[PDB]
Each structure stands twice: as structure tokens, then as C-alpha cells.
Design a protein around this ligand. Structure first.
Ligand SMILES: Nc1ncnc2c1ncn2[C@@H]1O[C@H](COP(=O)(O)OP(=O)(O)OP(=O)(O)OP(=O)(O)OP(=O)(O)OC[C@H]2O[C@@H](n3cnc4c(N)ncnc43)[C@H](O)[C@@H]2O)[C@@H](O)[C@H]1O
Ligand code: NA
Length: 338
């Protein structure tokens, strides 16, 4: 029976379409990056929606992670992951809540009338996806909600706490509440770095949370951006991981773990005990489809194995399995267990 997992992020509906390179130029976008919607992107949602074959699917980084983790523990629907974020009681909000609850996630979400539920433009150019997130309701997640009975109950019963780095743009204090709770319950606190812009523009917030963070998960690019933020003169992912273990402030007792994924190259796994690499199983690249990304899916599999007490390398193997499944989607039960 898996340990209970608490996930917090921004629940967003993904609005996905294939766009031209000129579409990216028009909107001031850098291919393959994620940003928050700004005035520079005025009109982008109307434009993408006016297209053929646009898709509307529940998204949000942490909600993706929660759904992949729950998919790996289907005997524990209602009894495994609780997700916290803020939505409106609108069409998008109802769909995000329904998809997650149908899958067995407990959706301890706030409702606001201050903005409509968030959405993310997912602009697909060949093999790459460029993401523009309009948080809407997600940016209004309140301290009142964080102290509400449903949320405190969920935190009290959970032993693994996962926040996306994307939460750092809302209110760092919400994150710190979970950081302190993880200590209270002798649990684990984990964050993903989410995007280079987190390190570029939310470094103060990230700095507040890192000392309380047991496991830091990122990809190759975010690891290099983290090195840049730290002023570390290295692009060596193994070395960046080594230094994030021992040089980034840490006040916990569970042990600091750093996990940096490298797409087809091996995943870097570091602890006080040393640095290892975990190979990614060979996959025919003609099976990799341009629909889904791999990062949240990796994190979902990682948490599904961590929750049942598997060693760190096995957690990585499980994340590779789930990531490889998700990127091949154009599937009822997993064919791999931690
Ligand atoms: N402000 C915000 N707030 C909240 N949500 C927000 C937000 N902004 C955007 N979002 C949300 O973000 C979601 C999309 O997130 P996500 O699903 O994570 O997609 P992504 O961010 O585009 O991730 P990448 O595909 O680039 O993966 P990665 O670089 O992290 O992993 P890696 O390549 O190392 O690969 C990892 C592993 O996968 C496997 N793998 C990957 N590629 C291959 C390959 N080609 N062949 C074999 N294995 C592979 C390997 O095992 C590897 O270790 C959307 O739903 C959106 O709503
Ligand atoms: Na991601």
C-alpha cells in the first residue's frame, strides 16, 4: 500500500495545436520553451483556437504527475494522491476536476470567481512544444484555502509532498506551509525545477524552498540553468548534481537526492553517497509522437515507485517506463510495476 502523496500545482486546460514557425515569431516565442502569458502574447489563445484540429485536454504539470502516479497504483483510487490547486466552477474547471476524480485523485481544489480556470497554449512545431501558460484561477490559490480543513487533513495524512517549480510564481508561502508539514510528519518534500524561467526570475522564491527540499528533480536544461543561477562554472550534469547535493543549503534529515533526466541519455542520480547514472531503455524514435512531453510522466512514475518504498534507482527506472509510455501516445493499465 503506497504512502499517501500530496501534490500542488496550477491546474490548467491544455489547448494544443500544430503551428507554423511564423506563429512563434508572431507571438515572440522561443521554440521548445515554457513561459507565462504576457502582454507580448496578447491574442494567442483566440488565434490557436481558430485553427484546425485544436485539442482541449486536462493539463497542468502537477496534475499530469498526479494522474501518472495514480495510473500506476490503480488498486488505490481515492487512497493515494491528493491534488491541491485553484480553479473556477467553469467548463474548464469542471473538466479538470472530473478527469482527475474519475481517475481516483482526491481533488482538494479551491474555487474562485476572480478569474476563469487556467489554460496553457501548447504550440507544437514538429518534435518541439512551446508552452504559454495563462494561470487564471490558479494564480488566486489563497492562504485561506491552504488552512482549510480539507487541505490540512490531506497534508496531515500524506508522507510525500510534491510541488512543481511552477508553484513558486503564485505564493511561496503556500509552498513553505507544505515544507514545514513534511518535517512535522517525518515525510519527504520534493520539487521539480519546471522551467529555466523559474531559476531566472523566481530565484528568491526557489531559494526559500530549497533548504527544506529533500529531492530536486529536473531535466538537462534546467540543471544547466540552475548551475547558471548558482554561478557554478560547469555544464556537466553529473557535477551539477554533485554540487546540488552538498552545496545547496539543506536542513533535512531524510537525505538530499538530485535527479536530472537527459531524454535518451542516462538519468543522473546523486546523493551524499555519490553520483550514478541510470540508463534509459532503447526506444525506436519513430514511436515517439509529438503530442505529449515526458517530464511530468517521468515524475509520476518516480513517485509511484517511491511511495511503495523502492530504491532510488528503481524509482528512476519506473519514471523511464511511464515517460516512455506517455511519449508514445498519439492505455488502460500499466505493464510495469515498481
Ligand atoms: N506555469 C505552469 N504551471 C503549471 N503547469 C504548467 C505551466 N506551464 C506549463 N505547464 C504544463 O506543462 C505540461 C507539459 O509538461 P511535460 O508533460 O513535462 O512536458 P515538457 O515540460 O514539454 O517536458 P519535456 O518533454 O521537454 O521533458 P523533459 O525535458 O522534462 O524530460 P526528458 O526529455 O529529460 O525525458 C524524461 C524521460 O523520458 C524518457 N524520454 C524522453 N524522450 C525520450 C526519447 N525520445 N526516447 C526515449 N525516451 C525518452 C526518458 O526515460 C527520460 O529520462 C502541460 O500539461 C502544461 O499545462
Ligand atoms: Na515538464
Amino acid at each position: 500500500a503506497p504512502l499517501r502523496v500530496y501534490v500542488q500545482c496550477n491546474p490548467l486546460l491544455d489547448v494544443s495545436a500544430h503551428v507554423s514557425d511564423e506563429f512563434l515569431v508572431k507571438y515572440g516565442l522561443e521554440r521548445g520553451t515554457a513561459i507565462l502569458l504576457s502582454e507580448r502574447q496578447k491574442g494567442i489563445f483566440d488565434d490557436i483556437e481558430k485553427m484546425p484540429n485544436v485539442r482541449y485536454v486536462p493539463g497542468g504539470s502537477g496534475l499530469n504527475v498526479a494522474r501518472v502516479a495514480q495510473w500506476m497504483q490503480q488498486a488505490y483510487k481515492g487512497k493515494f494522491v491528493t491534488y491541491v490547486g485553484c480553479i473556477a466552477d467553469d467548463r474548464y474547471g469542471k473538466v479538470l476536476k472530473e478527469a482527475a476524480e474519475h481517475e481516483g485523485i482526491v481533488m482538494a481544489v479551491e474555487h474562485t470567481t476572480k478569474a476563469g480556470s487556467g489554460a496553457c497554449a501548447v504550440c507544437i512545431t514538429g518534435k518541439e512544444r512551446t508552452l504559454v501558460a495563462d494561470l487564471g484561477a490558479a494564480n488566486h490559490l489563497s492562504s485561506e484555502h491552504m488552512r482549510s480543513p480539507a487541505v490540512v487533513r490531506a497534508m496531515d495524512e500524506s508522507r510525500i509532498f510534491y510541488f512543481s517549480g511552477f508553484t513558486l510564481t503564485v505564493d511561496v508561502n503556500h509552498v513553505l506551509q507544505a515544507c514545514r508539514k513534511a518535517r512535522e510528519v517525518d515525510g519527504l518534500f520534493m520539487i521539480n525545477l519546471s522551467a529555466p524561467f523559474i531559476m531566472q526570475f523566481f530565484s528568491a522564491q526557489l531559494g526559500e524552498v530549497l533548504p527544506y527540499t529533500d529531492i530536486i528533480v529536473a531535466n538537462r536544461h534546467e540543471a544547466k540553468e540552475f548551475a547558471n543561477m548558482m554561478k557554478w562554472d560547469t555544464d556537466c550534469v553529473e557535477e551539477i548534481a554533485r554540487r546540488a547535493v552538498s552545496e545547496v543549503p539543506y536542513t533535512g534529515t531524510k537525505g538530499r537526492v538530485v535527479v536530472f533526466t537527459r531524454d535518451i541519455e542516462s538519468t543522473v542520480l546523486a546523493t551524499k553517497d555519490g553520483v550514478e547514472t541510470v540508463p534509459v531503455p532503447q526506444l525506436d524514435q519513430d514511436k515517439v509522437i509529438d503530442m505529449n512531453g515526458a517530464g511530468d510522466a517521468f515524475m509520476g512514475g518516480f513517485l509511484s515507485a517511491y511511495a511503495v518504498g523502492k530504491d532510488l534507482r528503481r524509482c528512476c527506472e519506473t519514471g523511464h517506463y511511464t515517460a516512455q509510455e506517455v511519449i508514445q501516445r498519439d492505455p488502460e493499465k500499466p505493464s510495469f510495476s515498481p
